[PDB]
Amino acid sequence: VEEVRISLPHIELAAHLFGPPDGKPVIALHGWLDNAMSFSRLAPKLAGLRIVALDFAGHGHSAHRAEGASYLLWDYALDVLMVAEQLGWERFSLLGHSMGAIVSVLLAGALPERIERLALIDGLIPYTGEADKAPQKLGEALKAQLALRHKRKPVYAELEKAVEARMRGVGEISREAAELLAQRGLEPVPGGYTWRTDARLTLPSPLRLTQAHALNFVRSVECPVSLVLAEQGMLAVEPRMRALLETLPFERHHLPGGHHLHLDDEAGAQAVARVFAAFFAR
Amino acid sequence: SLQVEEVRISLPHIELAAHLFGPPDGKPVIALHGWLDNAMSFSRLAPKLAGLRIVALDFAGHGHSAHRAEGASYLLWDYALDVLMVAEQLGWERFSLLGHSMGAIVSVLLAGALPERIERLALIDGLIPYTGEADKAPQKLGEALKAQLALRHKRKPVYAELEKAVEARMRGVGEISREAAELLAQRGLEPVPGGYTWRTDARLTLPSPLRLTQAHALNFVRSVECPVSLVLAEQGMLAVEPRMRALLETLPFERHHLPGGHHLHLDDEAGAQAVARVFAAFFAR
Amino acid sequence: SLQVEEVRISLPHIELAAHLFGPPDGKPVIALHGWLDNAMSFSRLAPKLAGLRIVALDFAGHGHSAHRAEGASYLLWDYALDVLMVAEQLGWERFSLLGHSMGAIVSVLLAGALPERIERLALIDGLIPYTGEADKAPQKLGEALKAQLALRHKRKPVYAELEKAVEARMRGVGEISREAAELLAQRGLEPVPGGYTWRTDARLTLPSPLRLTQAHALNFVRSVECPVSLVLAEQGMLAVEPRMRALLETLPFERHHLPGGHHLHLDDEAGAQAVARVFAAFFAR
Amino acid sequence: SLQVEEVRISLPHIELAAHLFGPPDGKPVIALHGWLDNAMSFSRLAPKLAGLRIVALDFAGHGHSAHRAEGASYLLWDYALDVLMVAEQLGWERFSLLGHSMGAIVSVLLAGALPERIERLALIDGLIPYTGEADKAPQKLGEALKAQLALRHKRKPVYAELEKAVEARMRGVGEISREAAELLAQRGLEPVPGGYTWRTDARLTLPSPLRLTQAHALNFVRSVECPVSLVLAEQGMLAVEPRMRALLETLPFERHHLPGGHHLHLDDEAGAQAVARVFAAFFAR
């Protein structure tokens, strides 16, 4: 059994299973609008780890949330904990990419008794917003909810065109990465494929974490952390982020590659696996 | 000859119940009630306010409104979105808010977020929510996540006598008159095997995953651009809180203090009339 | 001291609305209304039946009851299950049914299927549904499947004026009085941008995928074990289908022929009283 | 490029899972499995049907497809509507059906109801459902309603060991190869606290409220207009029964008895090859 559907009280999620059942327990969390194939190159190279590569709600093959429910960062965090519950995992590790790393950091700072270590790829904290702009940000979220019903779903008469659309998407990623994502990310429609998604995933949060919030979460992490930063990712590029990371104990490894370096090619996957295999052996 | 007084309002994600008061051509007002109450909170006040077309709305998970779908939250800004979608479904572009306790807090959030939509605020014994600072936010998220994991299917209290259901509501919150409790019970009880239960959603007991900071709350109140009339109960808590008074002296809101408890507009005809005098004059101009 | 008259009844799969009539300790009766009507169908009749505890239920997708979840059907046995679950949720082991039109049909199905639970049947101008034999069944299923594919494209009329919503109900279906249409409108209208719509589920227009055959219907009628009182409107069912008269002659139901239309119990006080006299004597035995 | 093998198919009311086999330009076929099985039922068979574009569908409630919403039924004609909607979502107007057991019964209902849509039926060890006559229908509805009430108290079994769940598949109704059980278990088992559980919806155990009569079932089989290839197991009840043998000689369906059990296309590679041969020819004509 390597592809399972996990039933939570409120939602059903899909996950792809890697590694030996006696392996160290890991939940692998992907980035915004991706799916579990984000780890298709990396997970097989991490021997000794039992890796549950989860599709977040509204992504890959996991269910969309019920009517009215939100896609906030801590909704994902709850879902992950309930996945751990269904597996019998009391302490487990998190391997996260981008948004998945942000969710992992929130979980580790909120529930340090549950999280054994963090392996993070080019993600750490969310975009923040301060109290002075909060009334305005809530108005924007409420107005976008009203407009949500009239929200676009693109269609692609043919496979490689959908792949190509993803190569030019949120960030730059290799054709093979896009192909790997597409195998879990496309659903058939009349007249071809669309990228399975939930329009609500484009809604702005009604309440952003303030910088102090984000800082208190990273400061609340109690387990070891290995943070891979892509040289051509804009995380490593931001100067404020370099300053923040120097104040933190997290283990940093800069590696050549883009935001999706673990997926773009076998060389990036192998480079990332080296760092994390060593991390987990300790 | 007969007029429509009780309706379902269909929103895209949920169906809510509402009682309609006043002339179809009256000034448009949505009335929002307190936590674990329902639209009967306005059963004495709304009839006393002539010239107003008042939609007294049951919040999700209260009164006769639907419970939210599985996995959905009961955060303050979820109610705020529901209220705005009600105004859309009614075809209302600009409207006023009449709010009691939690309903007042929701009204402030809406007015501060969307000043172009809210004409005025009439607030009863409520203004800003309890707040939480960033240094405690990790601990509060963990408590919120733990409570979610622990939430269970349990038989809420059952009362074989209606009298006893009413009495259980008097023991609750602060002080509330027997008449107020009975009015709330008419819309707040559901039949179950062997009696009545106070209809509720278990998720309403869960703590927020992320509270507003004191600075968030201040920014929302300082962002309200429309006229505001705030009534404080003399035997409630807000009228005695000195931090509350210091805040109000920095704000342009009209303030009135009236005798009675936290439900003064519901306890008796006199308090209902006392609040109506303040709101009728405010809405008249 | 105030009594509870309007409630939500929570079933495992749906939440229904009901109006409560009579003393809490009266004989238990669930009152079931006609297709596209609501509990106000019993607004004149139920108050006249002293000593009966009547739960006037809104069927799913009608009045103020919730619409069924996505993909669920509105077949006659679906309503029967709901009614059985309503009795469970009220704690009622044995109970009687008071049914009008479609609601009478559902009552007969329930009485025939679970005779152990049903003490008495009071039926107003309804008995069996329209039937279909096996030779048209593949055709009818194809037509039901096609209607399901085409259902996305359904919309409900909007009435800017309340009077216009009422008059739309007098023309629609059979002939009912202006007062009847007003009474049903009090519980059947919801507000929408620029006016009112008769609250309804578009699935209610779908044709059944499998109609009961004539033998099914007659077996259900024959399977009723309890005393039955049937009211026959002079201008209702029998005027529409005089073939029924010979069936009725082979059944042990008590029959009362009364003037008026299909909604004789709601059209006016004269019909309400006459039906009430018949049912009040029936329920006393 | 890599190819898309596993997909979700979004219908208006439910989201299903499917595995895609074969050349994207091949003959359009939807493959339908048996009660409590899943798309792995076609794991051996579909790879051997070259030239065919086979959508191996998980029925609602089975495998990796969503469960139906609260209150929705799992009746034969609900599956049939889902299959039609899958075809629409795929942009298929005319298509073939490959069905095992329950899936074959669904396919016959579809062909009989919409002959203009179904190119060919390839049926494995199924044809019509168990029927029931009108004189038993009140009692059968009663049993279905009672089962709906009792379903509350059920909890699904939990196997601490993978294997006890697999070999739990072999026990009960049906004889089936261990390879068959493990193949089905790959898509039909889910991890839970305590071990694994079979993913199928507990409501799948509910008896139908209304069976087709013999006449209905005959009218459907006799309404099928397209070519039909039916494979019967010699080790199955369908082939041996005389009333069934008599019916088949009256029907213009290509018929082949093959050695093997009810799941002969899945028990072993030899059985799969055998069925492949018959169907591969049938689809070439």
UniProtKB/TrEMBL annotation, chain A:
InterPro entries: AB_hydrolase_1 (IPR000073), AB_hydrolase_fold (IPR029058), AB_hydrolase_sf (IPR050266)
The keyword Aminoacyl-tRNA synthetase appears for this protein: no
Every AB hydrolase-1 domain range: 24-140
Keywords from the UniProt entry: Hydrolase
Signal peptide: none
Stored Pfam families: Abhydrolase_1 (PF00561)
A GO molecular-function annotation: hydrolase activity
Family: Belongs to the AB hydrolase superfamily.
Protein name: Probable hydrolase
